[PDB]
Amino acid sequence: MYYGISQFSEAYNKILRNSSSHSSCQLVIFVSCLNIDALCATKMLSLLFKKQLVQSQIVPIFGYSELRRHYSQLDDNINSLLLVGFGGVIDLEAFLEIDPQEYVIDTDSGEQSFRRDIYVLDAHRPWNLDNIFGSQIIQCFDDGTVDDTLGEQKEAYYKLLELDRKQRKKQIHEYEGVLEEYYSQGTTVVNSISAQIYSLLSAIGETNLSNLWLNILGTTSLDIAYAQVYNRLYPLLQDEVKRLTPSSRNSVKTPDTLTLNIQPDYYLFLLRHSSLYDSFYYSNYVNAKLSLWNENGKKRLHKMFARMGIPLSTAQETWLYMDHSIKRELGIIFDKNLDRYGLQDIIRDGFVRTLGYRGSISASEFVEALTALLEVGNNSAQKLTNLRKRWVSNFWLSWDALDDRKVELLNRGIQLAQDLQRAIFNTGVAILEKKLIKHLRIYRLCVLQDGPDLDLYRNPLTLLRLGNWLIECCAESEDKQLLPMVLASIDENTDTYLVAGLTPRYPRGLDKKPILNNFSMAFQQITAETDAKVRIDNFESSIIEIRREDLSPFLEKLTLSGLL
Amino acid sequence: KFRYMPFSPAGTPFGFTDRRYLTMNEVGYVSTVKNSEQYSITVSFFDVGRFREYHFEDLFGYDLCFLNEKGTLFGQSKTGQIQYRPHDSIHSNWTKIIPLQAGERITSVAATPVRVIVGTSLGYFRSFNQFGVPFAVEKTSPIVALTAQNYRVFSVHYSQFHGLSYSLSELGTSSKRYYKRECPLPMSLPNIKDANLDYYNFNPMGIKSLFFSSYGDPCIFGSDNTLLLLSKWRSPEESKWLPILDSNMEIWKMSGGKETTDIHVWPLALAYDTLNCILVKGKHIWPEFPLPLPSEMEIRMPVFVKSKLLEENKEIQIPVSMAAEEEYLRSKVLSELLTDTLENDGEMYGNENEVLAALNGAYDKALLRLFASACSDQNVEKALSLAHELKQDRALTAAVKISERAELPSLVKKINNIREARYE
Amino acid sequence: FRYMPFSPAGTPFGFTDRRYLTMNEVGYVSTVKNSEQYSITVSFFDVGRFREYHFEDLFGYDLCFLNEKGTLFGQSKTGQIQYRPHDSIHSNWTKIIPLQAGERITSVAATPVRVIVGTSLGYFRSFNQFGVPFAVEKTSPIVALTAQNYRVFSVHYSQFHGLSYSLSELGTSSKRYYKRECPLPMSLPNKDANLDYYNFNPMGIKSLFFSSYGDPCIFGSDNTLLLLSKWRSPEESKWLPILDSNMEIWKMSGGKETTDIHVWPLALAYDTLNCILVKGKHIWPEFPLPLPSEMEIRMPVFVKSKLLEENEIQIPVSMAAEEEYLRSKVLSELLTDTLENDGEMYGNENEVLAALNGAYDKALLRLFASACSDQNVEKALSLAHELKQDRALTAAVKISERAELPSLVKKINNIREARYEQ
Amino acid sequence: TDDKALNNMVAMRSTEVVLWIALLLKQQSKCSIVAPQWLTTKELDRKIQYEKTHPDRFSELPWNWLVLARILFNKAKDDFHDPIHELRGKIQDLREIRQIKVLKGL
């Protein structure tokens, strides 16, 4: 459909034809900040437009309210827009207040052209049909979803668009019935935005190891929450590492050799940058298998190190200084022992980059560093705006850390990630010890009223770290039914709760068709029904804000909702 | 008995690695990477203004390639699968299978703006048009190598029962001609340790590359590391092969007279006057994946007596008689190639007539530098022969000036007869 | 394969300090192994024109070529060549020629106008008569060269090519190949005498030369003399076998084999091979060189078992007429091909043609009498078509009248009447 | 600068251009920069031997050798025939010997 995978070169050549001149800046990229995949996509896409000498402006955007503000004030000379990581699921023609008649030029002939193009690079679904069919200005990129999945919706969309009494009743309610089933699907991410732009670089003939690393980083960020998607794309990344890696083997290490191997990348927290003990203690997956919040879980961890034959005094050494024999024997120690605890799934092959003599970083460890930069790198309308300014300001810390010249900023990130995961854990234990997860039949509720350094959880990403930790913890327990989870946290200064709706997921080794985030409808439909004050402006529309006293009325109508 | 292997110009073996070049020439290069029982092929261009690189995954395991300015042709030697991929992708790719008998293989493939050409180890020769319509089946001596440039096709044939031979063709959109059919080819096969044998198991003929020069005169670079260019081929009764680089000698010369084993030439194209090639260094003869820049070797006629160079050097200095003998011969052959191009094809850059004028200028200056040696040794007879071959009437004034400076008044009078004879 | 250095009619040492390097119409060249030096003697078969000399050889020249202007020498392994004109008013000159490791100069040739060097890797090098280089070319490996009056004839051989030849003329604009690397129909050799000679010269070419009228010749291991006919028009060219030399020896022996006569070719003058005849446990000439003898050319139309059964040998005269007709037919086409192209060399030549048509007709009328004696009308009528000229039709009627066979006359008069009116 | 060298480019036949244009073309994929003969591990090692052998003099390196080494190792890192870590190593070996000879000169 709009631009299928076969025809990304035509959309790119259309950008060059429309927006390349030495006279002016003509291209704007709007990127959702608070999304690593949109960050790695936009980094690749800027290195491309650098090499083509296309004068461009990148604007990081927090949410839909800022998208309208920034679009409203675009200089009329700007004739191409990229919307990277958002806007596929909203009607952009309605939302931005477009009327195509104010944008059309050279209408002659079975023909149109327009003074602006709006290219949507988005991996979320269900796609809004008035973008994918119902507009000539908005120009979505596709992984293949539309031709493979939307053929009944295409037909239903047009027969209903054409039809502006038995023969009518018999058909208008068939086609509205197809759209009414197409909406009333929950949200999901089905691709990485970076693997889409790498398949565009593959069409132009621009692939190299720097663009491949950004493709691996952008795609790795999915693994925590969309494991089913990482596993589709992972086979395709292995082939590209082989294709681009040079001939030499048994090579001497030199300050200039970049090597991007595929090798064991254990599912542990910041292994190469922390101790072997903290690697297990702060891992989501390990915590979920050993029940590691309570002190019998901590006994199971020591009892494992003792049985592996690693002293606690060695396991706690920083991984560089930990001894040369353990670090090469470790593959054999894990292949012997992890099976006893069911930790067998920790063995994984991943992508490991090392540059010169500065020591290896895995794609997993690098996205933990880049997210920690977005999260903590630095009158309610001012109290929101001077906070959303901070989250736009952090985007450029994560951006600059993608550069190899700036390893000191990556090393800030790798320290911040270890400060965060410790705070997530010290909060996640409080929730499980104090029994704060209430079972409400339709969903599970959790609400942080008070606690130490609670002022972290007002960033949408840090709330999702704690969400993904509580989800892994539940998803491995064999007695619990899988249920949607609502996680709420107060800001004592704004006097709102940040509320996040979370999908459950299957245990990390079991191998089904996906499950979808329908809080994105349930929150809108309850909001439209109530007189309560909320914000529904975030790009991940599973996340909302609500004033303190309105929350209990809101949850009281959420449990009644048939939409979950 | 002899074993037929698939050939592609400048392609390399896998050796111990998981990757090789299927081909290289003036357009670009192609490499294949072994990738868990399927392959990935990357096609790269030396001109990035005209062509955009691409890659695909190959399920079939192609081992033949030919790359030109219109498309890339792939073949799988053992199953007879061929595929043509045009470069604009306005035209579709196409795929076909050609009928191989038991133990038959495709030995090489080529493409022309209007034809795709396939040759096999039993010497069938199958033409398809540019869209995959069969146009012919000939039978020939088995074709061990093919090349094309525009409408010209050049093939090398070999069999135990026929010896080495070549054919040269110009198939055209109209007025098809075969210039030579199966004429004998004056090129050395190898003297049949693993540094050589891992290459000769892959390419038994030792043809490192087969190409046309940029002006469309055939070239071949054999196991003997000598570049042979076919002269005057547009008129078959006057054709000859010229050895225009002895590249072993030209390496020994630049490494200062060390017998040098760690360096090998790998040829890509002869632009006029200069072989584009990789100089490979190390114990394998062929280059590796980060393809080094094509170096340039200027062509040199093989008139360098190594023993004389040894005694006068004991950076290499070349005796000024030997240097003048080479520049006179090199200029005489290049001026004949340009002259025949300009007369039969016409110029493609306006410069070519100004190159030819400058090239005659280097010929007469080389002959006068030989005439000085003939005067120094007072061989008036040798001097008069050198003066008679001299072209410009204005350069023959220098011959009489040199003969007066040498005080050889016989040469003065004889040269004055040449002035009047050539004026008439 | 051995790629030995070659020179026309040269001989091995063969456990002796003397050998010939070369022989021609002009003369011969021989070398003596003068302790750890060599001494070269450049004799002549005509001391009225040129005078013999000796010179000392420092290098060990193992190649030579002699023309009437000068002698060219070369060292096959060091790549040195040296040209020595016979009139010392011209300078001697010396050149060293490049060689790759293991490459050898396999032969050289010289003419007044051009000097040629071949090699075991097939680089064919050319100079003018003062040692200015003209060209380098590559060919299939040279194993023999000969030249005259700026023509060249070369024989090439390799495992990868088979036995072949080339034939050049240096036109004023450019060098033109009449034939390039066409396969050569000479037979290669298959104890002591053979093994000494074939270790010296494994191609078995005993000599290689142009005829007195400039048509190529070769004498091979098989003792046959071949002459290339019609070569001025490539599409009609034929190698003619014009001696089976063993057959003249068997004939001159009176119908006996011999191990103790052998023939060494010097050159072909029209209808006659100028040659040397040797009696030996060995097959090549000795030091006290015989006076150059003559063999008249004989086409191979004689059956050995028939001649001894019929029987100095007395030839059955129809098998004499069968040669006389065939031999005259070839010489007629060879002389005419030169006379209409290269004019007259020596001036007797147009008279020789008119005498040669008369020999050809005499043999046809001798066959015609034999065919009338068979009463074979149809055979006799075919010979009556093949007469050159008008007067010989009179003998065709007279013999067919005499043989009481006027069925021939009734056709033959129709041939005559058509031939003279039209 | 001479305009006639740039309007006459042909892919992969070498040409000379002014260095600021070579770097501007090499910033796109549109060029590759041929290092001078003195940026070879052979010629650098002959200059290092000269430097050690003649305490009294500096070797005949071109006036721009440190500047051009630093430009090309950053902008044209892929275009050397020798492995760039041995070239950086010998540029440093030359830098250090000349610094001793300077301190003697003062």
Q: For strand B152-157 and strand B165-170, is the pairing parallel, antiparallel, or unpaired?
A: antiparallel
> Identity (one letter) of the amino acid at A500?
A
Closest residue on chain C to B300 (Cα):
C136
Which of D29, D82, D85 should be substituted to probe chain A, the one whose Cβ sees the most A Cβ atoms within 10 Å? D85
Q: Give CA–CA dist C116/C104, Å, rounded.
A: 14
**Which helix (DSSP H) or strand (DSSP E) does residue A381 occupy?**
helix A380-400
Chain B residues near residue D78 by CB distance under 8 angstroms:
290
Which of C75, C89, C163, C180 should be substituted to probe chain B, the one whose Cβ sees the most B Cβ atoms within 10 Å? C180
Question: Cα separations (Å) of A430 from A419, A479, B1?
Answer: 17, 22, 82
Chain A residues near residue D84 by CB distance under 8 angstroms:
256
Residue contact D14–B292, C-beta within 8 A: no
CB of C233 within 8 Å of any CB in chain B? no
Q: Do chains D and A touch (3 or more CB pairs under 8 A)?
A: yes
**CB neighbours (10 Å) of residue C53?**
14
Q: Give CA–CA dist A494/A199, Å, rounded.
A: 43
Question: Cα separations (Å) of A92 from A87, A129, A140, C311?
Answer: 6, 11, 11, 120
Q: At what angle do helices B409-423 and B380-388 cross, to 10 degrees?
A: 20
Which of B328, B333, B381, B389 should be substituted to probe chain C, the one whose Cβ sees the most C Cβ atoms within 10 Å? B381
CB of C180 within 8 Å of any CB in chain B? yes
Q: Give CA–CA dist A268/A279, Å, rounded.
A: 5
Spell out where chain C is interrupted, by the residue before each break (C to N > 2.5 A).
Answer: 190, 311
Query: Collapsing DSSP states into helix, strand and coil, what is residue B259?
Result: coil
Which of C77, C117, C154, C160 should be substituted to probe chain B, the one whose Cβ sees the most B Cβ atoms within 10 Å? C160
Residue contact A239–B40, C-beta within 8 A: yes
List, as one string, the DSSP characters of C78-107.
T-EEEEEESSTTSPPEEEE----TT-----
> Identity (one letter) of the amino acid at A234?
Y
Residue whose token pair is 């340039």: B296
The DSSP letter of residue B204 is T
Residue contact A256–D28, C-beta within 8 A: no
Closest CB from B48, B268, B294 relative to D30: B48
First to last CA, chain A: 30
Resolution in A: 3.7
**Minimum distance, in Å, between the CA of residue A201 and any CA atom of chain D:** 14
Residue whose token pair is 């070839």: C330
Closest CB from B164, B238, B305 relative to C160: B164
Q: Do chains D and C touch (3 or more CB pairs under 8 A)?
A: no
Q: Give CA–CA dist D1/D24, Å, rounded.
A: 15
Residue whose token pair is 């909320």: A534
CB of D27 within 8 Å of any CB in chain B? no
Residue contact D28–A53, C-beta within 8 A: yes
Closest residue on chain A to B52 (Cα):
A205
Q: Give CA–CA dist A62/A65, Å, rounded.
A: 8
Q: Give CA–CA dist A35/A42, Å, rounded.
A: 11
In sequence order, what E strands does B200-358 have?
Answer: 209-212, 218-221, 226-231, 240-246, 263-271, 274-281, 295-298
Chain D residues near residue A256 by CB distance under 8 angstroms:
77, 83-85
Chain B residues near residue C177 by CB distance under 8 angstroms:
237-239
Q: Give CA–CA dist C162/A502, Å, rounded.
A: 84
Q: How many CA atoms within 13 Å lie on the side-chain side of D92?
A: 7
Chain D residues near residue A255 by CB distance under 8 angstroms:
85
Q: Give CA–CA dist A158/A139, Å, rounded.
A: 18
Chain A residues near residue B17 by CB distance under 8 angstroms:
247, 249
Tokens of C280: 């030996």
**CB neighbours (10 Å) of residue C150?**
15
Give the residue from A31, A85, A36 showing the smallest Cα distance to A363.
Answer: A36
Question: Cα separations (Å) of C83 from A288, C54, C93?
Answer: 99, 15, 5
CB of B350 within 8 Å of any CB in chain D? no
Closest CB from A51, A53, A254 relative to D85: A254
Closest CB from B48, B268, B274 relative to D29: B48
> Which are the contacts of C337, defined by CB distance < 8 A and separation ≥ 6?
C215, C229, C230, C232
Show which of residues 22-51 on chain A sit within 8 Å of chain D, judged by CB atoms. 51
Residue contact A255–D28, C-beta within 8 A: no
Tokens of B148: 């094309």
Could you give the strand order of the β-sheet that contains C38-44, starting from the edge strand earlier in sequence?
Answer: C18-23, C27-32, C38-44, C54-57
List, as one string, the DSSP characters of C26-47.
SEEEEEE--TTSEEEEEEES-T
> Do residues A113 and A104 make contact, with C-beta atoms less than 8 angstroms apart?
yes
Which of C75, C138, C173, C231 should be substituted to probe chain B, the one whose Cβ sees the most B Cβ atoms within 10 Å? C138
Residue contact D78–B47, C-beta within 8 A: no
Which of B293, B295, B296 should be substituted to probe chain D, the one whose Cβ sees the most D Cβ atoms within 10 Å? B293
Q: How many CA atoms within 13 Å lie on the side-chain side of C246?
A: 11
Q: Give CA–CA dist D41/D38, Å, rounded.
A: 8
**Minimum distance, in Å, between the CA of residue D11 and any CA atom of chain B:** 5
Q: For strand B152-157 and strand B143-149, is the pairing parallel, antiparallel, or unpaired?
A: antiparallel
> Which are the contacts of A300, defined by CB distance < 8 A and separation ≥ 6?
A290, A291, A292, A341
* β-sheet bridge partners, residue B156: B145, B166
Closest CB from C131, C133, C140 relative to B184: C140
B67 alpha carbon, distance to own chain's centre:
16
Inter-chain contacts counted by CB atoms under 8 A, chains A and D: 11
Chain A residues near residue D83 by CB distance under 8 angstroms:
254, 256
Question: Cα separations (Å) of C180 from B220, C139, C142, C147?
Answer: 19, 9, 13, 15
Show which of residues 77-136 on chain C sit within 8 Å of chain B, judged by CB atoms. 79, 90-91, 93, 96-98, 100, 121-123, 128-133, 135-136
Query: Collapsing DSSP states into helix, strand and coil, what is residue A13?
Result: helix
**Minimum distance, in Å, between the CA of residue A468 and any CA atom of chain B:** 35
CB of B44 within 8 Å of any CB in chain D? no
Q: Give CA–CA dist A473/C273, Å, rounded.
A: 112
Interface of B with A (CB under 8 A): 17-19, 33, 35, 40, 42, 52-55, 57, 288-290
Query: Collapsing DSSP states into helix, strand and coil, what is residue D92?
Result: helix
List, as one string, the DSSP characters of B65-110.
EEE-SSEEEEE-TTT-EEEEEESSSSSPPEEEE--PPTT--EEEEE
> Which are the contacts of A107, defined by CB distance < 8 A and separation ≥ 6?
A113
Q: Give CA–CA dist C249/C261, Å, rounded.
A: 7
Rg, Å, chain D Cα set: 16
Closest CB from A51, A53, A256 relative to D84: A256
**Minimum distance, in Å, between the CA of residue A303 and any CA atom of chain D:** 48
> Do residues D24 and D6 make contact, with C-beta atoms less than 8 angstroms apart?
no
Q: Give CA–CA dist B250/A368, Å, rounded.
A: 57
C391 alpha carbon, distance to own chain's centre:
35
CB of D4 within 8 Å of any CB in chain B? no
Reply yes or no: is the peptide bond before residue D62 cis, omega within 30 of 0.
Answer: no
What is the residue extent of each domain of chain C?
Answer: 1-301, 302-422
Give the residue from B145, B336, B157 showing the smallest Cα distance to B231.
Answer: B336
> Identity (one letter) of the amino acid at B106?
I
> Do residues B341 and B352 make contact, with C-beta atoms less than 8 angstroms apart?
yes
Question: Cα separations (Å) of A184 from A125, A150, A520, B55, C161?
Answer: 12, 15, 10, 41, 81
**Minimum distance, in Å, between the CA of residue B23 and any CA atom of chain C:** 26
Closest CB from A205, A207, A247 relative to B288: A247
Residues found in chain D: 106
Whether the CA torsion B369, B373, B376, B380 is positive or negative: it is negative
Closest CB from A51, A255, A256 relative to D28: A51
Closest residue on chain B to D9 (Cα):
B47
Closest residue on chain D to B50 (Cα):
D11
